[PDB]
Amino acid sequence: VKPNYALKFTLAGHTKAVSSVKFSPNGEWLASSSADKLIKIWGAYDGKFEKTISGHKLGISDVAWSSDSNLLVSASDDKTLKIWDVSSGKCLKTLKGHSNYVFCCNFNPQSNLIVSGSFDESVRIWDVKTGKCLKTLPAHSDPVSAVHFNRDGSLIVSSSYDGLCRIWDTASGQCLKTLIDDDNPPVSFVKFSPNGKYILAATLDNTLKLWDYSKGKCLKTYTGHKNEKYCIFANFSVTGGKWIVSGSEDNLVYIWNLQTKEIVQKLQGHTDVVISTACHPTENIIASAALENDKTIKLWKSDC
Numbered sequence: 400v401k402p403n404y405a406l407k408f409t410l411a412g413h414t415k416a417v418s419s420v421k422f423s424p425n426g427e428w429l430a431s432s433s434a435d436k437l438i439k440i441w442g443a444y445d446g447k448f449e450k451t452i453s454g455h456k457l458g459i460s461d462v463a464w465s466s467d468s469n470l471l472v473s474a475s476d477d478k479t480l481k482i483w484d485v486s487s488g489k490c491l492k493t494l495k496g497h498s499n500y501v502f503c504c505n506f507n508p509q510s511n512l513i514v515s516g517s518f519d520e521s522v523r524i525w526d527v528k529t530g531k532c533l534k535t536l537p538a539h540s541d542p543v544s545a546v547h548f549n550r551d552g553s554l555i556v557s558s559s560y561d562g563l564c565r566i567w568d569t570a571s572g573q574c575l576k577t578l579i580d581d582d583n584p585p586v587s588f589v590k591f592s593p594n595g596k597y598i599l600a601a602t603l604d605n606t607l608k609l610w611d612y613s614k615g616k617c618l619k620t621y622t623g624h625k626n627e628k629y630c631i632f633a634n635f636s637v638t639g640g641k642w643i644v645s646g647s648e649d650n651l652v653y654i655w656n657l658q659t660k661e662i663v664q665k666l667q668g669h670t671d672v673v674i675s676t677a678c679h680p681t682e683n684i685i686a687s688a689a690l691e692n693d694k695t696i697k698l699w700k701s702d703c
């Protein structure tokens with residue numbers, strides 16, 4: 400069985416490179432961030448523009464939703480994160496502390512915490528209620544490319560251009576494990592699987608790898624795409640068939656069979672690097688976003 404994703408909507412409106420797209424947990428919305436310093440909110444099923452949220456002084460690298468779909472956090476080149484009320488568009492908190500570009504962000508499942516990673520090589524854990532930094536982790540010796548909580552929020556994984564993925568205890572801020580091999584090329588993205596037992600990591604040698612967290616060993620490698628430069632988002636698609644979904648520097652969305660590692664689809668449409676993909680929480684829907692020569696988001700749907 401293969402999926403049959405087909406283009407349903409093209410979401411135009413950003414005036415510069417799109418940097419991230421994320422579906423709200425309740426499945427109703429898509430948020431996008433851009434080098435044009437804006438966040439846009441769109442209908443998840445029809446691609447209908449809903450609103451623009453503005454306030455950052457420089458480009459935005461990432462956006463992430465709270466578990467109740469009411470708040471957004473954005474990570475900016477202006478060295479700050481902002482927490483937004485989605486329904487009003489108001490900035491509730493500005494999180495200051497990083498000394499350089501903030502590249503990545505995520506809420507924990509309870510959504511009382513935010514984790515951020517920065518060009519300043521640190522990982523920070525922030526209290527949502529107060530906006531206070533709770534912990535600064537001396538995580539890496541190069542820019543932090545991604546940060547992600549596991550399904551119960553007890554662990555954080557961080558990745559970096561230094562080649563390591565590190566798993567941290569959220570409560571204590573101590574490192575529990577480093578995912579490491581004989582050779583360790585730059586890691587451009589990392590995330591836990593939805594079941595919490597595995598980690599997906601992208602390296603800048605055109606490879607994605609699935610690691611067993613318990614054993615600290617690689618189980619599967621996915622190749623065929625191009626990724627030598629950019630921090631490209633990848634995903635587990637779990638609503639229908641079990642796929643790995645990623646963008647690519649050949650401007651395609653790649654879909655692999657999780658178990659066999661075979662490419663099952665390549666989605667064509669974007670006219671620049673597909674920097675971000677996201678998978679809808681309940682329906683077989685993928686969102687893809689592209690850089691400056693394209694500036695669009697595309698929504699794709701499959702029966703499978």
Ligand SMILES: Cc1cc(=O)c(O)c(C(=O)NCc2ccc(-c3ccccc3C#N)cc2)o1
Pocket residue numbers: 592593594595597618635637638641657
């Ligand atoms: C909560 C949630 C709901 C889902 O439907 C779902 O597919 C996921 C998930 O993490 N899929 C992703 C996923 C599924 C299976 C495996 C896997 C690979 C090799 C050997 C064993 C296994 C296992 N086992 C890895 C990742 O978890």
